[PDB]
Structure formats: structure tokens, C-alpha cells
Design a protein around this ligand. Structure first.
Ligand SMILES: Cc1cc2nc3c(=O)[nH]c(=O)nc-3n(C[C@H](O)[C@H](O)[C@H](O)COP(=O)(O)OP(=O)(O)OC[C@H]3O[C@@H](n4cnc5c(N)ncnc54)[C@H](O)[C@@H]3O)c2cc1C
Ligand SMILES: [Cl-]
Ligand SMILES: [Cl-]
Ligand SMILES: [Cl-]
Ligand SMILES: [Cl-]
Ligand SMILES: [Cl-]
Ligand SMILES: [Cl-]
Length: 261
């Protein structure tokens, strides 16, 4: 039904995000891109909410979630965590920071995990939609270091769109590490504010020209299959779906209601 466990650490990140570390049960095996449902009895005894696991399964003791405060339950959890921590800076007491019991239900799979069996992949995300791809990019790094022979993936085109510049900070370190360690040019990283991030990669501005992007990527990889993976709003999905048909790219019909405009 679920595993009892605890928040072991947290962070308060820009654009209203709660970075959460949760102790990983001995039984909990997952794949990059998976999500779980979480219950926090302190916020609500009975509600379960889904979040993508932003950590990689290669990381041994903790699971990570990046939860954006957009409403009632997420807003309360953010507030609970902040207030416990604000009381700690004053009191300095262990009593001001009790530890947060939670229950987790998972893992639950998604088709994005099939990136590991693809040759060429496009990854497109908006806002907090980045989280499955954060997990996936980390796991790719672990896998290439541990056993490069065993991975068929030859090129990853990554696109991350944000309304607010400060949101890129959620994963700026992971993206720096990729830039530093990608000697063989596995990754093509693209950041769009809809270097500028302090990365080698220049933050671009406006809505990407998806027709031009897809055209270029099709030329790079023809006549092979390219797989498109997406986590964003529906108006964008419609555009991408049309373009996948036009260029013969793999598409999964999925919707992400928490990312709508
Ligand atoms: C597979 C999966 C993975 C996910 N991964 C993540 C993740 O990594 N990170 C993440 O932050 N989130 C993720 N989500 C979304 C997440 O599960 C949260 O439940 C949701 O984002 C917030 O719940 P809430 O109670 O705080 O907000 P809610 O109160 O439900 O608010 C939801 C939204 O709907 C609007 N709304 C609420 N009530 C009403 C109403 N009565 N009338 C009209 N509009 C209303 C709110 O303004 C808000 O914009 C994921 C969801 C799924 C299904
Ligand atoms: Cl492990
Ligand atoms: Cl918003
Ligand atoms: Cl609630
Ligand atoms: Cl809020
Ligand atoms: Cl072919
Ligand atoms: Cl819609």
C-alpha cells in the first residue's frame, strides 16, 4: 500500500520550489523518469499527490522531489517546511526541526524511460516539467561513466523553457557538470527564457522556432529514428505532435495538466 519514511533534508529554491530529500526504503527500486505519490499527514491525513523523482536511482540513500507551491497542498507543505526552518534559525533547537513523516507509493513508470533504448532523442520541457529529465540526465552520466559500451543513445537534444530566469537555478549545477564532462558531445543543451545562466550555453530568448529545430535535427539523423519526449503545456504538445508527423519522429500522446498556461 505504501512505505513509511521521512524528510531528511529540504531546500527553498526560486520560483516557489521546495526541494525535498526523502529517505529511500530498502525495497524502493526505480527507474529514471518514474514518479511516486506522497502523503504528508501533517498537511493532510488522506490526500496523496504525485511528483516525479528528480534524483537518479544510482544515488543510494535518498529520493529527491522538486515540488512547486502552486496551490493548497503544495503551498501548505512549503509553509510547513519554511516555518520549521525559520524557527530553527532563531531557536537553534533540535525541537524547532522535528523531522517530517511521509508515506510514499511508487514507483510508477512513464514512457520517457525508453530514452535509454533510443539512438537519438529530443527532450522538451517547460518549468517544473524538467524533473523527469533531471533524473534521466543524471542517470545517463552515471551509466556512461560505469559502462559506456552498454548504452545505445548517441545524441540528446535538450530544451528547457522558463518564464522566469531564476527557475534555471533548480538544475544549474547539473547542467554545468554536463557541460564540463561531455567531452564526446553527447548533449546539445538549449535554455529558453520565454552566458546568461553563467553556463557555457547561452540562454536564448522568446519561444523556440520548433519548425526550424525539428528540420535541423531531422537532417542530422536521417534516415534513422528520432524519439521526442515532452513534459509541458498542451498548446506546445499540439505543435510538437504535428512536427513529429511531418518529420517522422516518435511521439507519445501525453498530457500534463499541472503545466498548462
Ligand atoms: C505524474 C506527475 C508528476 C508530477 N510531477 C510534479 C513535479 O515534479 N513537480 C511538481 O511541482 N508537480 C508535479 N505534479 C503536479 C502535482 O502533483 C500537484 O498535485 C499539483 O501540482 C498541486 O496540488 P495542490 O493541492 O497544491 O494544488 P491545487 O490546489 O490542486 O491547485 C492546482 C492548480 O489548479 C488550480 N485550481 C485549484 N483549485 C481550483 C478551483 N477550485 N478552480 C479552478 N482552478 C483551481 C490552482 O490554482 C492550481 O493552479 C505532477 C503530477 C503528475 C500527475
Ligand atoms: Cl542503489
Ligand atoms: Cl504560475
Ligand atoms: Cl489541503
Ligand atoms: Cl501558493
Ligand atoms: Cl533506417
Ligand atoms: Cl488545456
Amino acid at each position: 500500500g505504501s512505505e513509511p519514511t521521512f524528510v531528511v533534508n529540504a531546500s527553498l529554491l526560486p520560483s516557489k520550489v521546495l526541494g525535498l530529500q526523502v529517505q529511500r526504503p530498502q525495497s524502493f527500486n526505480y527507474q529514471p523518469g518514474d514518479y511516486l505519490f506522497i502523503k504528508c499527514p501533517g498537511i493532510s491525513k488522506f490526500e496523496w499527490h504525485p511528483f516525479t523523482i528528480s534524483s537518479a536511482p544510482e544515488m543510494p540513500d535518498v529520493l529527491t522531489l522538486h515540488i512547486r507551491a502552486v496551490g493548497s497542498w503544495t503551498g501548505k507543505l512549503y509553509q510547513l517546511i519554511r516555518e520549521q526552518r525559520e524557527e530553527w534559525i532563531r531557536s537553534g533547537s533540535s525541537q524547532s526541526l522535528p523531522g517530517v513523516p511521509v508515506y510514499i507509493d511508487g514507483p510508477y513508470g512513464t514512457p520517457s524511460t525508453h530514452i535509454f533504448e533510443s539512438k537519438y532523442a529530443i527532450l522538451i520541457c517547460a518549468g517544473i516539467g524538467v524533473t523527469p529529465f533531471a533524473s534521466i540526465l543524471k542517470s545517463i552520466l552515471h551509466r556512461n561513466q560505469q559502462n559506456p559500451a552498454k548504452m545505445p543513445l548517441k545524441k540528446v537534444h535538450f530544451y528547457w523553457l522558463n518564464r522566469e530566469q531564476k527557475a534555471f537555478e533548480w538544475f544549474v549545477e547539473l547542467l554545468s557538470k554536463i557541460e564540463a564532462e561531455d567531452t564526446n558531445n553527447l548533449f546539445d543543451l538549449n535554455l529558453y527564457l520565454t552566458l546568461i545562466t553563467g553556463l557555457k550555453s547561452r540562454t536564448k530568448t522568446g519561444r523556440p522556432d520548433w519548425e526550424e529545430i525539428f528540420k535541423d535535427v531531422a537532417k542530422q539523423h536521417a534516415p534513422d529514428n528520432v524519439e521526442v519526449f515532452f513534459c509541458g503545456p498542451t498548446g506546445l504538445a499540439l505543435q510538437l505532435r504535428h512536427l513529429c508527423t511531418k518529420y517522422g519522429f516518435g511521439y507519445r500522446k501525453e498530457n500534463f495538466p499541472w503545466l498548462e498556461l
